[PDB]
Amino acid sequence: LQIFVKTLTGKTITLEVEPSDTIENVKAKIQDKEQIPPDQQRLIFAGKQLEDGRTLSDYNIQKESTLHLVLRL
């Protein structure tokens, strides 16, 4: 399963994910590609900030969904 994350430079990266992946799991995938610690990451889907603990399927995030990475500090 693949989703897009718009990166700090406006660039797009694709992430390979699973439907039951947690938001913490997605932040760890972004840490591996962009080297931003998960605690400095805020992830947005359709204007709403995603929270650690919940899964992609919990937010109805599906193939080709786009998350927005913005930095906290």
Fold assignment, 1-73: Ubiquitin-like (UB roll) (3.10.20)
Residue 59 CB-density burial (10 A; 0-12 exposed, 13-18 middle, 19+ buried): middle
Q: CB–CB of 31/7 below 8 Å?
A: no
Helices (H), 1-73: 23-34
Distance separating alpha carbons of residues 57 and 20, to the nearest angstrom? 6
Residue 73 CB-density burial (10 A; 0-12 exposed, 13-18 middle, 19+ buried): exposed
Q: Resolution in angstroms, to 1 decimal, for this deposition?
A: 1.8
Give the max Cα distance, the chain.
Answer: 30
Give Cα separations from 64 to 1, 29, 39, 71, 73 (angstroms): 8, 16, 25, 22, 28
Distance separating alpha carbons of residues 71 and 5, to the nearest angstrom? 13
Q: CB within 8 A of 52, min separation 6: which ones? A: 22, 23, 24, 27
Q: Which candidate, 50, 44, 49, 17, places its Cα nearest to that of 33?
A: 17
